[PDB]
Amino acid sequence: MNSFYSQEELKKIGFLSVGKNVLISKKASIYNPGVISIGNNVRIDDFCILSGKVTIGSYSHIAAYTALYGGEVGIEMYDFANIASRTIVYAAIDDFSGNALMGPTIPNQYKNVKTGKVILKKHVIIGAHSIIFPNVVIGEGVAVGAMSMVKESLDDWYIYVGVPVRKIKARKRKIVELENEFLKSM
Amino acid sequence: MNSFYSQEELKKIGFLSVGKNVLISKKASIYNPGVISIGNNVRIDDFCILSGKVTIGSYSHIAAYTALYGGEVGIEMYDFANIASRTIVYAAIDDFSGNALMGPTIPNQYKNVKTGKVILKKHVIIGAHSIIFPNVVIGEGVAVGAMSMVKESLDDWYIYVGVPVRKIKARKRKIVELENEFLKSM
Amino acid sequence: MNSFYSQEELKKIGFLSVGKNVLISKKASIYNPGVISIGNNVRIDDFCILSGKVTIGSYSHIAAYTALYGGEVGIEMYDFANIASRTIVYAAIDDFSGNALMGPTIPNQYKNVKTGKVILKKHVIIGAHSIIFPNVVIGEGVAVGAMSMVKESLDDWYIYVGVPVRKIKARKRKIVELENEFLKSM
Ligand SMILES: CC(C)(COP(=O)(O)OP(=O)(O)OC[C@H]1O[C@@H](n2cnc3c(N)ncnc32)[C@H](O)[C@@H]1OP(=O)(O)O)[C@@H](O)C(=O)NCCC(=O)NCCS
Ligand SMILES: CC(C)(COP(=O)(O)OP(=O)(O)OC[C@H]1O[C@@H](n2cnc3c(N)ncnc32)[C@H](O)[C@@H]1OP(=O)(O)O)[C@@H](O)C(=O)NCCC(=O)NCCS
Ligand SMILES: CC(C)(COP(=O)(O)OP(=O)(O)OC[C@H]1O[C@@H](n2cnc3c(N)ncnc32)[C@H](O)[C@@H]1OP(=O)(O)O)[C@@H](O)C(=O)NCCC(=O)NCCS
Ligand SMILES: Cc1cn([C@H]2C[C@H](O)[C@@H](COP(=O)(O)OP(=O)(O)O[C@H]3O[C@H](C)[C@@H](N)[C@H](O)[C@H]3O)O2)c(=O)[nH]c1=O
Ligand SMILES: Cc1cn([C@H]2C[C@H](O)[C@@H](COP(=O)(O)OP(=O)(O)O[C@H]3O[C@H](C)[C@@H](N)[C@H](O)[C@H]3O)O2)c(=O)[nH]c1=O
Ligand SMILES: Cc1cn([C@H]2C[C@H](O)[C@@H](COP(=O)(O)OP(=O)(O)O[C@H]3O[C@H](C)[C@@H](N)[C@H](O)[C@H]3O)O2)c(=O)[nH]c1=O
Numbered sequence: 016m017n018s019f020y021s022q023e024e025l026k027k028i029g030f031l032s033v034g035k036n037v038l039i040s041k042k043a044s045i046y047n048p049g050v051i052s053i054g055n056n057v058r059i060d061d062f063c064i065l066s067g068k069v070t071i072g073s074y075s076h077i078a079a080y081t082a083l084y085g086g087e088v089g090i091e092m093y094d095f096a097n098i099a100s101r102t103i104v105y106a107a108i109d110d111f112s113g114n115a116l117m118g119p120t121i122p123n124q125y126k127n128v129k130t131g132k133v134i135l136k137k138h139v140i141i142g143a144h145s146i147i148f149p150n151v152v153i154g155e156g157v158a159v160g161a162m163s164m165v166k167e168s169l170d171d172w173y174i175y176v177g178v179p180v181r182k183i184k185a186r187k188r189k190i191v192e193l194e195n196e197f198l199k200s201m
Numbered sequence: 202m203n204s205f206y207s208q209e210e211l212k213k214i215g216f217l218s219v220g221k222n223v224l225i226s227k228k229a230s231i232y233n234p235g236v237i238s239i240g241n242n243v244r245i246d247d248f249c250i251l252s253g254k255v256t257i258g259s260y261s262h263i264a265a266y267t268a269l270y271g272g273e274v275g276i277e278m279y280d281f282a283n284i285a286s287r288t289i290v291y292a293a294i295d296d297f298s299g300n301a302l303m304g305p306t307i308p309n310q311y312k313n314v315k316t317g318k319v320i321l322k323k324h325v326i327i328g329a330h331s332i333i334f335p336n337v338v339i340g341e342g343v344a345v346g347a348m349s350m351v352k353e354s355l356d357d358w359y360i361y362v363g364v365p366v367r368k369i370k371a372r373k374r375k376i377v378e379l380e381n382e383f384l385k386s387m
Numbered sequence: 388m389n390s391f392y393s394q395e396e397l398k399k400i401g402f403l404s405v406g407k408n409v410l411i412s413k414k415a416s417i418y419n420p421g422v423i424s425i426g427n428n429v430r431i432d433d434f435c436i437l438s439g440k441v442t443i444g445s446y447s448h449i450a451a452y453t454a455l456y457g458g459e460v461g462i463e464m465y466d467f468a469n470i471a472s473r474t475i476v477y478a479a480i481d482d483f484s485g486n487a488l489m490g491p492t493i494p495n496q497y498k499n500v501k502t503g504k505v506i507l508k509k510h511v512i513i514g515a516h517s518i519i520f521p522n523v524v525i526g527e528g529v530a531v532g533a534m535s536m537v538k539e540s541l542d543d544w545y546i547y548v549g550v551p552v553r554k555i556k557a558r559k560r561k562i563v564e565l566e567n568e569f570l571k572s573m
């Protein structure tokens with residue numbers, strides 16, 4: 016069938032805000048829903064995790080198995096941004112260098128958590144099995160390929176691939192005009 | 202212990218067809234069972250997702266977290282094909298180029314979904330964390346490595362790796378002799 | 388909210404041994420708890436799988452989606468080791484070469500399972516979306532970057548990346564003084 020909440024059960028979750036035509040899987044996890052807000056026409060699929068401060072506009076699909084670790088600073092997606100399956104977005108990560116201790120079992124004073132808001136601008140697409148690390152803006156109209164890793168802010172309207180990513184090609188801007196056409200008839 | 206459904210629970214599912222000794226996780230998601238056939242001696246683990254048209258033969262393991270998105274055209278596996286953990290197989294995929302809007306929140310006329318049957322032939326093995334794209338015939342006896350990305354059909358009896366995959370060596374065919382012998386015991 | 392067991396429900400799983408302050412998601416899967424041991428201050432998140440023989444010490448996070456397939460020979464992590472999200476550790480994998488049949492639907496005669504203990508020593512961290520294969524000792528202090536693949540044992544206090552991994556730099560050892568200072572103030 017499908018595993019989505021009814022519009023009725025959504026209201027019971029306690030989101031900061033949730034628009035219309037919001038389909039969220041019952042097999043997703045939602046932690047601290049009072050700091051999570053969703054526009055209209057959002058779909059979030061089985062085995063996703065939203066945890067902490069996350070904000071999603073409208074016309075966004077968060078595909079299956081995707082984790083959004085919004086922490087305190089948060090993750091924000093703008094309209095028409097989509098995220099394919101099995102992606103992680105971190106707004107916070109532990110320091111790997113060996114200069115600090117690590118992870119939730121250890122108190123803050125021994126760790127060196129790197130944290131910064133993450134933003135996906137309008138029309139961003141994030142390819143399957145990718146990772147986005149903290150304190151990064153993914154530019155307007157940016158496509159990130161499958162299995163790619165992003166550690167820095169990405170320039171608008173390009174397609175990036177690889178670990179860590181590299182620019183390979185301009186993204187076509189035809190979507191801008193299609194979005195105007197779509198909005199019209201809606 | 203294990204999380205597999207009963208023969209009794211399995212029949213309650215409504216599969217287009219289910220064979221014998223089928224072990225399906227209660228923690229998998231099965232969408233539109235009505236279009237899904239499974240032969241004999243098949244195991245499907247936790248957190249898999251089968252959605253839309255998916256045909257599976259016999260002697261096949263779909264390991265944990267693997268998503269098979271058959272859509273309309275479908276995904277087929279021949280006998281002795283196996284898929285290791287956290288793989289995605291897409292029978293349909295959105296246009297990443299920027300020539301078109303994307304994903305299930307948006308109507309089809311604004312999109313440009315690529316679709317085509319995906320076929321895994323006999324003795325195919327797909328390594329963990331791999332991705333197969335639409336309209337791809339994975340040749341008989343092909344092995345694709347961990348973390349593989351497959352956008353195009355793959356010639357029989359080869360080992361491939363990488364993103365996207367390249368052909369690194371031949372697969373031996375000794376496995377065909379062992380199939381014939383296994384069958385002759387059985 | 389959070390999705391962990393109370394310390395009461397923990398005792399009802401029948402681990403070879405569970406310590407105190409042990410947070411385990413109800414959305415995780417635990418097979419054969421009889422051969423699994425867990426020290427103290429350990430968190431195991433949603434959609435993890437622990438199957439067969441698994442030994443975790445103290446001060447360890449096993450992040451979401453992570454799968455530890457310990458089979459019979461086992462996976463052992465020492466204290467202050469952590470695994471980030473969507474990692475797989477295998478103590479047994481099947482032969483990809485074509486010399487043998489594959490997976491849990493086939494009798495052992497016809498297979499050529501590679502087995503070998505996996506050990507992660509003190510302060511190891513494994514980055515997200517990584518894979519560690521059988522018979523590998525990850526030396527004390529090792530860091531493996533995200534989206535990496537490990538088929539061989541790794542030297543102490545080095546940072547490794549890639550598929551399969553290459554050494555890129557020394558790990559800083561300030562973490563050795565920090566554990567001292569932290570353990571003391573307790
Ligand atoms: C990123 C992508 C769009 C590029 O496809 P393309 O426009 O057809 O370009 P090509 O396949 O010609 O690749 C161009 C270069 O990028 C490399 N490349 C392509 N995809 C890559 C990836 N995901 N990671 C690393 N390298 C990649 C190719 O090797 C090639 O390298 P070269 O120039 O050195 O030969 C596509 O490869 C991809 O990753 N799609 C992801 C689809 C997806 O995740 N869908 C989720 C459901 S909507
Ligand atoms: C692909 C695989 C079979 C190759 O192993 P191998 O035949 O033992 O070959 P090697 O390890 O010598 O590697 C051959 C070349 O391919 C590369 N390579 C190997 N595995 C690769 C992978 N998964 N991704 C990218 N490259 C890989 C090596 O770098 C080497 O490159 P070079 O010739 O340019 O140096 C193995 O690496 C693998 O990926 N196994 C997957 C195991 C799995 O997914 N198991 C699930 C549980 S059953
Ligand atoms: C491994 C890691 C610590 C390296 O970071 P760094 O020390 O800042 O090193 P740099 O980013 O300058 O990269 C050094 C080299 O490694 C390459 N590289 C870095 N990380 C890589 C990775 N994960 N895979 C493949 N290559 C990688 C870089 O391209 C660069 O190569 P070059 O010398 O050929 O240019 C980091 O990139 C990483 O993977 N962190 C994972 C964090 C994680 O998984 N967190 C989970 C939540 S806590
Ligand atoms: C994955 C999933 C599916 N379902 C149900 C409801 C859905 O309408 C139905 C089928 O959805 P589906 O995801 O199989 O098919 P689509 O509705 O076409 O969606 C998908 O294909 C596109 C081409 C990709 N770009 C998407 O990333 C991919 O997830 O099954 C759920 O209820 N929950 C889920 O998590
Ligand atoms: C993963 C999984 C396991 N189980 C139960 C039933 C099983 O008999 C038992 C142990 O299964 P396991 O999958 O850990 O181990 P195996 O049955 O040996 O299979 C595994 O190792 C092989 C070498 C790989 N080729 C497989 O891909 C891997 O999944 O646990 C479940 O009930 N559901 C599951 O999803
Ligand atoms: C992921 C997850 C979270 N939770 C709840 C209880 C937790 O205390 C709360 C916060 O968990 P969280 O994982 O969103 O956030 P943190 O407690 O900061 O943990 C995370 O950020 C760090 C920088 C990383 N090193 C970790 O690997 C990452 O998972 O949400 C659960 O109940 N179950 C879960 O699986």
Ligand SMILES: [Cl-]
Binds near residue numbers: 101266452473
């Ligand atoms: Cl996953």
